[PDB]
């Protein structure tokens, strides 16, 4: 039993983390085949980072200007390129430990593991969700840039997140591995606002279904409700509105537990209006929204 | 910024997880050098597990009776032995991916990462603490036995936990890697009681210090208190009593934040008596006790 935030086993991604330096900026890179992926502000000095013309900064630099450390420095930059806020450093040696991998732009609600990396070395691993303001609540210090987020499902590492920047909120913003930022964000030291952090209703529900499976059932109510009626209540508390696709993918969980989705939506409704009354569901006193339906199915079976 | 439950990078321990089978029992083993470590109930049939004479069951079995799968089956059991609830299967090949490692009996309060493993394959990684009833609140299914817990500090994997059994409570019990169970427990299907789960006061405090560093400061009070006076309040709420050694090891955190330990002990006291008032410290509505002082220092710097 039990239900904790799990991350994927990180070994496959560890053997891909390198140290990259351009001038005196050191950040982490992702080495896969003969290409070493990193955030593009590696080329920037401290004074440039207010509003920098990166392409103009990249002309200043050449192939030898970038130094990928790895364990010991034997990476020869054979080429360079700037794709949409990332640098791709073609190198001589192809990574012996390249796992089967793929680049994936995830969606809000979907979850991934983060391997936090300082100076090319992995420090820790935790599970994160991509929020609807397209930020993540992670744990990143200075030089966590270049750290990556992944799903290792079905033997294959799906890279979805590279970390770039913390925001004044204290939340973390970044990019897929083709460079483009999740959300409206940009890689400058300018004030940048995340929006409202709508809670991921379909995950709260899955985390509840997970709770019934682990033995917590006090939140189970004798009522039921409607999508439209639950959604009116979801709105006031700034929950994401529930779709039939959400009801679909909660299918197997409703099956396992013997509890219709809308019935769980009625427990959730009461749980939003009258609050949790000091009780704990699965060891939390708040409603947890960072386990997908898929996450719950996998950990409970 | 941010503060999430991190686990260590698991790669070093992944390359040590194997599949072990004796008769029709399949559980996970830990392969290190030419020895494959597993729980001793691998030898038991289903009917034996009520009260089994293991040593008598081990006479029935010989070197060929144990089949360590690994990726593909090429492990030749050259010897066998039963140390204090574990089997040690001397094999022909020494693990190419043996990390620097060590076996360590941890202490209550101390924390470790768990790599959950079903059929010799790692499934996920999460951080756990050894509770004072000597149980852990983990996430383990059927065939999680043989999964291990570790600290990877200073390049070296410190193995501390092998998983054996879930209890009727829903909590998890196991052993160090020399076999002996944490706590009073035994590897039989008999009813076995964990005691009171005293909360780890020195960790709640570190998790609070972590909160001041990340920007949450509402719980900061204008009062102070005494050890003896805080401890009287710790007792009613079944917190572990605070020592000067606890105050010592919180030193650097009191330094970083500019907040004396006892002052934090007075915030904690009010926080136990008047509760959290619906507010959240670091994203939790309860007091978190599974980050050590050491854990906090490492993640905040």
UniProtKB/Swiss-Prot annotation, chains A, B:
Inhibited by pyridone-containing alpha-ketoamides compounds 13a and 13b. In turn, alpha-ketoamide 13b (tert-butyl (1-((S)-1-(((S)-4-(benzylamino)-3,4-dioxo-1-((S)-2-oxopyrrolidin-3-yl)butan-2-yl)amino)-3-cyclopropyl-1-oxopropan-2-yl)-2-oxo-1,2-dihydropyridin-3-yl)carbamate) inhibits SARS-CoV-2 replication in human lung cells. Inhibited ex vivo by michael acceptor inhibitor N3. Inhibited ex vivo by compound 11a and 11b. Cleaves the C-terminus of replicase polyprotein at 11 sites. Recognizes substrates containing the core sequence [ILMVF]-Q-|-[SGACN]. Cleaves and inactivates human TRMT1, preventing tRNA guanine(26)-dimethylation of tRNAs. May cleave human NLRP1 in lung epithelial cells, thereby activating the NLRP1 inflammasome pathway. May cleave human GSDMD, triggering alternative GSDME-mediated epithelial cell death upon activation of the NLRP1 inflammasome, which may enhance the release interleukins 1B, 6, 16 and 18. Also able to bind an ADP-ribose-1''-phosphate (ADRP). Changing residue 145 to A: Complete loss of 3C-like proteinase nsp5 cleavage. It is found in: Host cytoplasm; Host Golgi apparatus; Host nucleus. This is 3C-like proteinase nsp5. Residues 1-301 form the Peptidase C30 domain. It catalyses: TSAVLQ-|-SGFRK-NH2 and SGVTFQ-|-GKFKK the two peptides corresponding to the two self-cleavage sites of the SARS 3C-like proteinase are the two most reactive peptide substrates. The enzyme exhibits a strong preference for substrates containing Gln at P1 position and Leu at P2 position. The lineage of its organism: Viruses, Riboviria, Orthornavirae, Pisuviricota, Pisoniviricetes. The active site is at residues 41, 145. Residues 1-301 are cytoplasmic. The chain holds residues 3264 to 3564 of 4405 of the full protein. There is a cross-link at residues 5, 90 (Glycyl lysine isopeptide (Lys-Gly) (interchain with G-Cter in ubiquitin)). 3CL-PRO exists as monomer and homodimer. Only the homodimer shows catalytic activity. Interacts with host FBXO22; this interaction promotes the proteasomal degradation of nsp5.
